Amino acid sequence: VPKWIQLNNEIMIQKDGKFQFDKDKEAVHSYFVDYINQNTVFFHNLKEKLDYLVENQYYEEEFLSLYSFEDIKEVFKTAYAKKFRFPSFMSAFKFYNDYALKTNDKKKILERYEDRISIVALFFANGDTEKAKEYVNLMINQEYQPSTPTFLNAGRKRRGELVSCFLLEVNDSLNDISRAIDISMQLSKLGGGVSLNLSKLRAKGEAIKDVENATKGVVGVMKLLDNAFRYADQMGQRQGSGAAYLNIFHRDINDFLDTKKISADEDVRVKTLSIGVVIPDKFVELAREDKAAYVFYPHTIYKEYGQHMDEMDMNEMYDKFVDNPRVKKEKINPRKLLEKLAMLRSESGYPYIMFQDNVNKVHANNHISKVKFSNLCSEVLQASQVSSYTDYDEEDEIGLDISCNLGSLNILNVMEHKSIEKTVKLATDSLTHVSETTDIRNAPAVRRANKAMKSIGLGAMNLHGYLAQNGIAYESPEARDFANTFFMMVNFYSIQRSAEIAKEKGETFDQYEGSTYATGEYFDKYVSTDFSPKYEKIANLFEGMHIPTTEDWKKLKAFVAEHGMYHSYRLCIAPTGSISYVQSSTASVMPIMERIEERTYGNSKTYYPMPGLASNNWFFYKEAYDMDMFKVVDMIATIQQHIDQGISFTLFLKDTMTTRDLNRIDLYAHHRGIKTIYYARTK
Amino acid sequence: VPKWIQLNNEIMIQKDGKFQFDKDKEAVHSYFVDYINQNTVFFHNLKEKLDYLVENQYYEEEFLSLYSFEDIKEVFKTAYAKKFRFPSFMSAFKFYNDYALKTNDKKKILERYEDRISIVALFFANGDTEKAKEYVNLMINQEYQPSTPTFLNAGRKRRGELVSCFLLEVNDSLNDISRAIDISMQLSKLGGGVSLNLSKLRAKGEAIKDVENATKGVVGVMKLLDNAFRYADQMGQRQGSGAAYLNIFHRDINDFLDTKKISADEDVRVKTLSIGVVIPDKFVELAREDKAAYVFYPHTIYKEYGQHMDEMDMNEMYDKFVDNPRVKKEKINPRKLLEKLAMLRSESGYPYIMFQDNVNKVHANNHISKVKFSNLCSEVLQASQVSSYTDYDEEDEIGLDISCNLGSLNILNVMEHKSIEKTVKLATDSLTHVSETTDIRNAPAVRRANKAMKSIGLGAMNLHGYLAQNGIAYESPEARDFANTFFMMVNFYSIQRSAEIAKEKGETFDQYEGSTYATGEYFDKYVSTDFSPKYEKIANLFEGMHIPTTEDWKKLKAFVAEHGMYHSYRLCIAPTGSISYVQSSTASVMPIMERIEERTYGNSKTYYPMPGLASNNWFFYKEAYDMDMFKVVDMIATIQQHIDQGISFTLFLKDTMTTRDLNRIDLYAHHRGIKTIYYARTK
Amino acid sequence: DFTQMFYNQNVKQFWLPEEIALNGDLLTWKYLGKNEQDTYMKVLAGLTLLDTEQGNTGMPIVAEHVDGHQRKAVLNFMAMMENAVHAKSYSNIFMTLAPTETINEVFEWVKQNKYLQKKAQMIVGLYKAIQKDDEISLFKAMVASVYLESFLFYSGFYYPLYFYGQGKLMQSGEIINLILRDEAIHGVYVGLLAQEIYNKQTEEKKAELREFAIDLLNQLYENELEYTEDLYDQVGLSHDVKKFIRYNANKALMNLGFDPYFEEEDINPIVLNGLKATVEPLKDDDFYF
Amino acid sequence: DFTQMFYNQNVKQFWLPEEIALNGDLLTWKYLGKNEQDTYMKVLAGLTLLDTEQGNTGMPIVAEHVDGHQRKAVLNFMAMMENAVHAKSYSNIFMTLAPTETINEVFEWVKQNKYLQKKAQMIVGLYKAIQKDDEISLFKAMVASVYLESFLFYSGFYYPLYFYGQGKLMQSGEIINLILRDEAIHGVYVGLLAQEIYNKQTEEKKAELREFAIDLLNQLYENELEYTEDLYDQVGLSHDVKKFIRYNANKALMNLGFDPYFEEEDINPIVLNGLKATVEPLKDDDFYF
Ligand SMILES: Nc1ncnc2c1ncn2[C@@H]1O[C@H](COP(=O)(O)OP(=O)(O)OP(=O)(O)O)[C@@H](O)[C@H]1O
Ligand SMILES: Nc1ncnc2c1ncn2[C@@H]1O[C@H](COP(=O)(O)OP(=O)(O)OP(=O)(O)O)[C@@H](O)[C@H]1O
Ligand SMILES: Cc1cn([C@H]2C[C@H](O)[C@@H](COP(=O)(O)OP(=O)(O)OP(=O)(O)O)O2)c(=O)[nH]c1=O
Ligand SMILES: [Mg+2]
Ligand SMILES: [Mg+2]
Ligand SMILES: [Mn+2]
Ligand SMILES: [Mn+2]
Ligand SMILES: [Mn+2]
Ligand SMILES: [Mn+2]
């Protein structure tokens, strides 16, 4: 066993009844003085390194050609001047195993952390040396972390796409289904997770040109997509991951759910395609009143009204659907469907739950389209227009397929540096650059939506780490007050940066004029309610930083009205799974699953303590499963009120609790304004 | 139990030690006195019937509008003047259960046999009343039978395409694979059987964008195609049928074959995807000499030579591939592979066997392309060019995808009417009309090849029926003499009609000038070898009909040289599954499987004796399983020497014979010039 | 002279309840009166109990004491059928036709039913009284087993057969016929083993063994009468079932090599209506013609 | 948590000796040397003798002492496979490859063999020591059973798998592979039953049961090494067989929920080629907060 492995395992060997957390630090030293420094490839100077990486097809030469070598040297020197040290063994291990650039045979390390950060910063700046240094300082301080696609692939010749998630709308036609399968394979080839809205597809037993009971429903398309994602599995490196979203009022909703039952037959079971359910407020109202609900056949509704079932408001059209004899429907028990959802989530963690009305009551771009589904991580909530892929030799009507670039603020590092504004603006600029340089030649709706919406996702990580390292319980009202203030600041500065980009470029996102940003409605709660901290401890935490007031929000509203906004969507809180290790941060705004996690790598086992875990903050690092899910819902709703897109909200459940407890948590989330629920992980 | 079913089951009841075959005739009468006439919709006049069928979206207005009502009435009167009577119960049952037009509620019969024949004739003639009457006389004499798609769908508004055999070339790309899946779905939606060539696809463990061990091979593509064919199942009417062809020198050939093993796992086995193997002469030479063979990685060959492995002659390329270090290959035992093929055919009848050099040594259009694969029934053998389907908003390079037009001569009815020439020419004209009226807007290469090649398949059936009713054993040399003469006359008149159509329209098929028809090579064996019958009995059978001599063939060769040939391909012998029942004929040129076949429809049993079966010809109606497969191979080769495309050749084996016997039959078929082997049906 | 043919017959009769789809009985079940459904559930529950003990206890214990690997293989196979196939099939039937509460209630009902407890007490008591190397205790248990196989099951079998014969509950009935086909051969086989032991005895000992067999049969019979009345009076069939069990008692005696004890009677005719390829390598001469 | 799942896997793996034609093995058997034929015969007899103990005693004794109807049914099914399927399969292989006199002599030799007897009697001793209502003695017997199913058979299985991986004796190798696949699931299942008992014990009692298991493993392992050299030195395979024994010992320990004892080793490639949360209804007022 390696020396650093033994040093890391020495953490759990208690001394005087206490964990040896400091041993972890020793491990990193070993991991660098025995493996990383020996396995790294050193050159005489930076010129030889850059030339070797360029000619050997490791780096794209275009982004490096925008800078003179003196500027690149200055950027690299700025990166190395911080003398960044990984405080935990797992941070360095995760970076050098998942994100550091290696040779073709993967026998040596070509990229250090500073090298990777410098390359990403130079790609972000697009020829601006000062901007590149700003990005270097932002990432080496670990205030901002680009998503895994962006951080791993920026400036690389053998790179994939920098966009993490893609959302596709599938129209009710064989041509559209085949095009959706093709685009899903193309985007999984690019490495991104693909989500498909199957609510427009007509249910099982519908007519294909006057021959009835002909359609296979959404389950056949689900099987096709599952095989497509199995085939396109990132060249066999990462398993192809897809998501299917169906409205709960679709007739196939049961069969949909039956794809995830552990007793499902092979002709129905789907195993590589995640499932999500979109629940309008009408379904929750029907379940609450115990009135029997009706699921609908989408094609009959489309024939009668000319629009898809998910294209209009069910809260106002459900009674018209039920009373219409030309609309076909089936009777269901909404409470039984809710119990089935809870049982499925207990068994397998599926489906994702999207509260459609919670998303669309604060959605700023309802004029473009209502949000009808979410992404594979159930945090992207954007307007999408379905595409009409016609026959060959016929022009296709290209719609809008959602796609946003992810980037997370490290809350602990951002607040320690007292740089919410600067970090938010620089992250917005980096995400705007990632969107601008993204061009996908096989997904036309994705390309058009990227060019028009200009949507980005600016997330946050290390919420629980910051709260526990500052002596604040994650479930406490003080923690929710901190989240309210911090994310109001993040939203304020993201809107300010979006408006500044719109002013400097003279262009807004497409159809911005009909948005609530243009009409000023979006700023209502910000121009009437003060989001400054209500607790003295939180206010002290925010000292040295100008917390925006109602007057600052009014000025920002006027600025947006004058100049517009460059981005249709700005903030989305992704799960941030593996890149949180490198940043020494807790995953996303979720509470920690465990204080010390035991992970098996190779034939060895390693223990990763939570960042900053110690004796004095052991009980502030409360495990998520031990927490009240209602207070976690309260925290997520408090954050969500300042996030325009959704938050990947994983439910952390105990084995003792029943499906009724899961249903109660889901209904409280819906009541509190939670937009989406990601996972039901049971301990 | 209905009266006609009792009268049909009375056949097996033996009187005086003989089957009551004549009772079947009585059954037909009952089937018409009790059921057909009662459930047949009658109109006051044909005008009312045509108006009702057109208005209720049963027929098409376009083809009926080309004639005055007097001409349509005259065509219907010509059809009804024959007073055609089905000689067996199963003929009428199959027609009125499969082909007769029924109401939307499927309880009444709108079309009789004469009505359907008249409608198909009017569709064929395209406005010529005399031509329509000629077609009516052809089909009511049952000399020619349009295929199930053409016969069932001609003149019907609610219909699939008139072509059901489609051959697709799949290029080695994700875009091409997705396009192939889409086209397969679209053609299965039209009701056609789709065959895909997977030899150009790179094997498992190949590089994608210079990353190693990334390709899933052809088995993942087969899984995708199997899911696509399961999804597209004729609006839930018939099981989606598809075929995949792989060259035996493709490295995936074992895994390909492993998709049909019973022991194969769920992630390996494809259930609704037929498989065929293309066997070049090089593989047979390697197996014969017991030298170990090499299966090659197609992408390495493409990188080294710039052409696909299946696009070049393996006979001259195999040694260069083996000696090339940059071509990756795996060692195999060709005799072990042959034994595996025989074992798999014994277990499941798969794969289909295509002898590439047997096809291509007589292929007339090798300049366009060599025949690389066959159809789902393993009888279509045509030149195909792969298409380069690029990314979106980029122009695709459309190639040639095979789609031939099926139609079968009834050898008994044709020869008893002494009308080989007239029937062949009229069938060629009808096939040309159906090929010209076919327009598929979702298969670009299929449409392009249909427009360019103008390839049709004119088959024959009732060969064994005709031979048995004339006191000739199917395995006798006299039967082979008759087949030689009859199919040489069929080829002569098909070529003459093709040249006449080319002269009339002033156009040949695309790239005809490079064909062996243009150079006169095709006629070589016809201008030197006399194909007149060598037996007096066969000559007396051909009495009253002019048998083309060598001088006639020289005149035809000169005529083709002067005027060209309209069809790239003219003759292919399809299995003729259900139309053989309606025509009261034995299926294809195959020998009969059973003298009397027992079938179960609903909860009732039915008995179909072979047409013309009696005590006198009971011995001549020898069952296929009791026959020597070498003599069946000899007869099929005798026919194949006059057929430009292949013949659906099913092997009929006993359970006693082993895989050595199957391999011997396959090798004798290869030796005798058999182009394709369809199935290995074990009794 | 017989074990090998019983071995072959037993293994060729192998089946699983999952081979029979049961959803086809859903409607004919729905259509029965509450009395009929109650009797049917209870009847099958009584059968389940018998097979549970025959599989857990009876067949394994007899297997332990019978000499010879082939005889043991047959008895082990029969034991597996009892609890892994027969007893389980009843749960397949219950799970299809009945809601969980009705299923729970009927299993509670077997525990408290005095006739079912008495018959289990008597049969299992004899199984557990077998003494190693004591052929007489073994004979007594084999008589008990034959009486379970060929007599005691039949108060239960009557009702599924009665429905099958009317074209009702035919999928459940198919399962029951397969179970009955097995028990018939099990009763014959165990009967032959019992006769082996009986034939070793003195005439005086034989006379005592016949007394044991007849006394046991009468005691079981009297209990079965009360059980039959308890179950069948509500469906009007008790007298008919009684005739059936007497018929089968005679078959059990015959399986033991004894004369019939009850007089012949006409049984309900409805119930009577209720009853790879070989591979050769390629030679170099197969490539030339 | 597991018995119904194992029931399913067991019954779906059902097979019969007659399914594999054995005669074609004579075409490779005739080409083996005397030492190869001798080792094969001796290994085969070893497996046969051990499997008979498992069919006559091991499985039935565990089925007797384990509580639970469904567990007894699964255990009965496993006992059936030993006696009705495996035993007949071993006999069939023997009768195909050797004449009657040779079979009798090999069994005489292996019956007297010191290393085969040592392990056979050690296992049987633990089965004979089970006491009614004593879960500790039952656990010890289950450990012995898992060691037989998942460990002791494998010094024997090695050779048929070695031939099977080379294309030799393919018919008997297919049979052995089916047998081995049954023993694997038997070992896993009995292992779960042992862990259930183990988990009901105090910490001191657990440590004591662990010491028992490791001590027993050590005794059996040291005898396996001697058994291995005795059979495999004459065909030069002992080094590789020893790696296979340790690898399978580790699997047996994992079946009992214990850590592996031996370091990980690679195995001979020829042999490798041969080888619900509680549903609670919504009560209303759960929609209001
Ligand atoms: N935790 C760590 N994170 C990142 N790099 C590290 C870490 N520990 C060691 N290294 C790398 O290994 C080298 C070993 O030097 P070390 O940290 O022991 O101190 P040093 O030799 O006094 O110099 P310096 O600390 O100034 O780099 C470091 O210079 C650095 O490049
Ligand atoms: N074998 C048969 N094949 C086809 N149609 C038949 C057959 N037998 C009877 N029919 C149908 O039933 C009708 C009655 O025929 P039948 O044998 O009674 O005498 P017919 O002289 O042909 O009668 P019709 O006056 O109808 O022409 C036929 O006209 C035809 O439509
Ligand atoms: C062709 C086909 C379609 N479908 C379903 C899936 C599609 O969502 C739906 C629409 O198919 P379409 O491609 O729209 O078929 P169509 O346009 O010819 O019929 P229509 O005019 O009624 O639109 O039909 C199947 O389930 N199986 C099939 O094989
Ligand atoms: Mg459509
Ligand atoms: Mg390519
Ligand atoms: Mn039983
Ligand atoms: Mn029994
Ligand atoms: Mn065994
Ligand atoms: Mn076992």
Q: What is the largest CA-CA distance in chain A?
A: 80
Q: How far does the CA of residue A428 sit from the closest CA of chain B (Å)?
A: 30
Contact (CB<8Å) A442/B223 = no
Look at the alpha carbons of B529, B531, B537, B539 in this order and tell me if their dihedral is positive or negative. negative
Find chain D residues with C-beta within 8 A of C73's C-beta. 83-84, 87-88
HSE (side-chain half, CA atoms, 13 Å) at B256? 33
Q: Strand A596-601 relative to strand A604-609: parallel, antiparallel, unpaired?
A: antiparallel
Question: How far apart (Å, rounded) are the C-alpha atoms in residues D285 and D289?
Answer: 8
| Contact (Cβ atoms closer than 8 angstroms) between residue A47 and residue A89 | no
Alpha carbons D8 and D2: distance in angstroms, whole number? 10
Hey, what are A393's tokens?
Answer: 């030799």
Instruction: Tell me how far CA of residue C211 lies from CA of B48, B417, C143, C195, C214, in angstroms.
Output: 92, 91, 12, 15, 5
SS3 label, residue B331: strand
Q: Are B584 and B572 in contact (CB under 8 A)?
A: no
Q: Which residues contact C271 (CB under 8 A, 6 or more apart)?
A: C158, C161, C162, C165, C240, C244
Q: What does DSSP assign to residue B604? A: E
Q: How far is the CA of C150 from the centre of ligand 6 (A)?
A: 10
Q: What is the Cα–Cα distance from A569 to A560, expressed in whole angstroms? A: 14
Question: What CATH code is carried by the domain that includes residue D176?
Answer: 1.10.620.20
Ligand number with the minimum distance to the CA of D189: 9
Burial class of D245 by CB neighbour count within 10 A (0 to 12, 13 to 18, 19+): buried
User: What's the DSSP call for residue B523?
Assistant: T
Q: How far apart are CA B432 and CA B564, in angstroms?
A: 16
Q: What is the dihedral of CA B335, B338, B339, B345, to 10 degrees?
A: 180
Tokens found for residue C232: 């069948």
Q: What residues form DSSP beta bridges with B458?
A: B407
Beta strands B406-410 and B144-146: pairing type?
antiparallel
Reading the block at residue B428, the tokens are: 């060629």
Phi-psi region of B682 (alpha: psi -120 to 50; beta: other; left: phi over 0): beta
Among candidate residues C115, C95, C238, C251, the one with its CA nearest the CA of residue C180 = C251
Q: Coil, strand, or helix at residue A171?
A: coil
* Catalytic residue (one of B8, B153, B171, B375): B375
D248-252 long-range CB contacts below 8 Å, 24 or more apart? Answer: D248/D150, D248/D151, D248/D154, D249/D151, D249/D217, D249/D221, D251/D150, D251/D151, D251/D187, D252/D146, D252/D147, D252/D149, D252/D150, D252/D151, D252/D187, D252/D191, D252/D217
Residue C73 · residue C50 · CB < 8 Å:
no
Residues in chain B: 683
Is A176 touching ligand 3 by the criterion CB < 6 Å? Answer: no
Contacts of A487 (CB under 8 A, 6+ apart): A460, A571, A638, A639, A641, A642, A643
CB A612 within 8 A of CB A413: no
Contact indicator for A382, A365 with CB cutoff of 8 Å: yes
Sheet bearing B352-355, strands edge to edge: B165-169, B193-197, B242-247, B273-279, B352-355, B676-677
Q: How far is D26 from chain A (nearest CA, A)?
A: 41
Residue to mutate among C276, C287, C288, with most B CBs inside 10 A, is: C287
Q: Give me the catalytic one of D40, D90, D115, D154.
A: D90
Q: B377: annotated binding-site residue?
A: yes
Q: What are the backbone angles phi and psi of residue A607, rounded to the nearest 5°?
A: -120, 125
The first and second tokens of residue A72, run together, are: 């690149």
> From the CA of D113, how many Å to the nearest CA of chain C?
22
List Cα–Cα distances, A586 to A91, A413, B280, in angstroms.
12, 12, 61
| A143-280+334-683: CATH topology | Anaerobic Ribonucleotide-triphosphate Reductase Large Chain (3.20.70)
Tell me phi and psi for residue A144, to 5 degrees. -130, 145
Q: What b/e readout covers B505-533, taking b as 16+ CB neighbours within 10 angstroms?
A: eeebbbbbeebbbbeeebbeebeeeebeb
The CA distance from D260 to D242, in Å, is 16
- Distance, in Å, from the CA atom of D194 to the CA atom of D71, rounded to the nearest integer, reads 13
Lookup result for tokens 């450990």: D143
Distance between CA atoms of C210 and C207, rounded to whole angstroms?
5
User: Ligand 2: does its nearest atom lie under 6 Å from the Cβ of B529?
Assistant: no
Sign of CA dihedral A302, A305, A307, A313: negative
Q: Helices C3-12 and C69-80 meet at what angle, rounded to 10? A: 30
B116: tokens are: 């359907």
Atom of ligand 2 nearest to the CA of B86: 3
Query: What residues contact B325, with CB distance under 8 A and at least 6 apart?
Result: none
CB atoms within 10 A of CB A362: 18
Tokens of A677: 């629920």
Task: Tell me how many residue pairs between chain B and chain C have CB atoms under 8 A apart.
Answer: 44
> Residue B3, Cα to own-chain centre: how many angstroms?
36
For C264, residues 6+ apart whose C-beta sits below 8 A from its C-beta are C247
**Inter-chain CB proximity A659 and D277 less than 8 Å:** yes
Q: Which two tokens stand for residue C63?
A: 């297997």
Rounded CA separation A460/A142 (Å): 12
In a domain, C283, yes or no: no
A226 CA distance to ligand 3 centroid (A)? 19
Q: Are B119 and B38 in contact (CB under 8 A)?
A: no
Distance CA D146, CA D149 (A): 5
Q: Which residue from B minimizes the CA distance to A213?
A: B236
Q: Does C134 reside within a domain?
A: yes
Q: What is the DSSP letter of B210?
A: S
- Alpha carbon of C89: minimum distance to chain B alpha carbons (Å): 28
| Domain residue limits at C266 | 1-275
Question: Least CA distance to B347: which residue of chain C?
Answer: C276
Q: At what angle do helices B174-189 and A174-189 cross, to 10 degrees?
A: 160
What's the number of domains chain C is made of? 1
CA-nearest of A208, A204, A220 to A328 is A204
Q: Which of residues 318-337 of B touch C (CB under 8 A)?
A: 335
> Relative to the CA of B112, which ligand 2 atom is closest?
31
DSSP secondary structure code for residue A145 in this structure: E
Tell me, in angstroms, the distance from the centre of ligand 4 to residue B171's CA: 28
Query: In angstroms, rounded to a whole number, what is the distance separating the alpha carbons of residues B102 and B108?
Result: 6
Q: Do D281 and A660 touch (CB under 8 A)?
A: yes
Q: Which residue has the tokens 């039937």?
A: C93
From CA A355, how far away is CA A646, in angstroms rounded? 10
Report whether residue B82 contacts ligand 2, using a CB cutoff of 6 Å. Answer: no
Instruction: Tell me the HSE value of A242 on the side-chain side, using a 13 A CA sphere.
Output: 34
Contact call for residues B246 and B199 (beta carbons, < 8 A) = yes
CB–CB contact D276 A671 (8 Å)? no
Catalytic residue numbers of A?
A: 375, 377, 379
Distance between alpha carbon D160 and the CA centroid of its chain, in Å? 15
What's the token pair of residue B380? 């279509």
- Rounded to the nearest angstrom, the distance between the alpha carbon of A173 and the centre of ligand 4 is 5
Cis amide leading into B280 (omega within 30): no
Is D60 an interface residue toward C (CB < 8 Å)? yes
Strands B651-653 and B604-609: unpaired
Q: Give the Cα separation of B353 and C276 in Å (integer).
A: 20
- Angle at D286 (CA atoms; ends D281, D287), nearest 5 degrees: 120
Chain B residue with minimal CA distance to A188?
Answer: B174
Ligand nearest to the CA of D188: 9
β-strands B406-410, B457-461: how paired?
Answer: parallel
The 8-class DSSP code of residue B142 comes to T
Considering only CA atoms, which of B156, B130, B136 is closest in space to residue B63?
B156
Are A358 and A674 a contacting pair, CB within 8 Å? yes
Q: Give me the resolution in angstroms, 1 decimal.
A: 4.0
Domain assignment present for D32: yes
Which residues in chain C are closer than 8 Å to B667, comparing Cβ atoms? 286-287, 289
Q: Token pair of B455, please?
A: 């390839």
Three-state secondary structure string covering chain D: CCHHHHHHHHHHCCCCHHHCCCHHHHHHHCCCCHHHHHHHHHHHHHHHHHHHHHHHHHHHHHHHHCCCHHHHHHHHHHHHHHHHHHHHHHHHHHHHHCCHHHHHHHHHHHHHCHHHHHHHHHHHHHHHCCCCCCHHHHHHHHHHHHHHHHHHCHHHHHHHHHHHCCCCCHHHHHHHHHHHHHHHHHHHHHHHHHHHHHCCCCHHHHHHHHHHHHHHHHHHHHHHHHHHHHHHHHHCCHHHHHHHHHHHHHHHHHHCCCCCCCCCCCCCHHHHHHCCCCCCCCCCCCCCC
Q: Which ligand is nearest to the CA of D145?
A: 9
- What per-residue string of b and e applies to A392-426 under the rule 16 or more CB within 10 Å gives b? beeebebbbbbbbbbbbbbbbbbbebebbbbbbbb
Q: Which tokens go with B463? A: 């060969």
Closest CA relative to residue A460, chosen from A236, A638, A213: A638
Please state the domain extents for chain B: 3-142, 143-280+334-683, 281-333
Tally DSSP H helices, then E strands, for chain B: 29, 17
Q: Which chains touch D (3 or more CB pairs under 8 A)?
A: A, C
Q: Report CA torsion sign: B532, B533, B536, B540.
A: negative
Is the alpha carbon torsion for B147, B225, A164, A199 positive or negative?
Answer: positive
Catalytic residue among B114, B206, B358, B377: B377
Please report, in angstroms and rounded to a whole number, the separation of the first and last CA atoms in chain C.
55
Distances (CA, A) of D33 to B650, D30, D37, D169, D271: 46, 8, 6, 14, 19
Asked if A667 and D281 come within 8 Å (Cβ–Cβ), the reply is no
Rounded CA-CA distance B653/A113 in Å is 69
Listed by the residue before each break, gaps in chain C with C–N over 2.5 Å are 275
Q: How far, in Å, CA of D126 to CA of B423, rounded?
A: 88
Q: Please count the residues of chain C.
A: 289
Residue whose CA lies nearest to ligand 2 atom number 22: B83
Please report which helix (H) or strand (E) contains residue A246, including its range: strand A242-247
Rounded distance between C-alpha atoms, residue B124 and residue B116, angstroms: 12
Q: Please tell me the distance from the alpha carbon of residue B303 to that of residue B88, in angstroms, as a whole number.
A: 60
Backbone angles phi, psi at A405, to 5 degrees: -95, 135
| Distance from C-alpha of B445 to C-alpha of A5, rounded to nearest angstrom | 60
Side chain identity at residue D207, one-letter code: A
Give the position of tokens 């690019």: A190
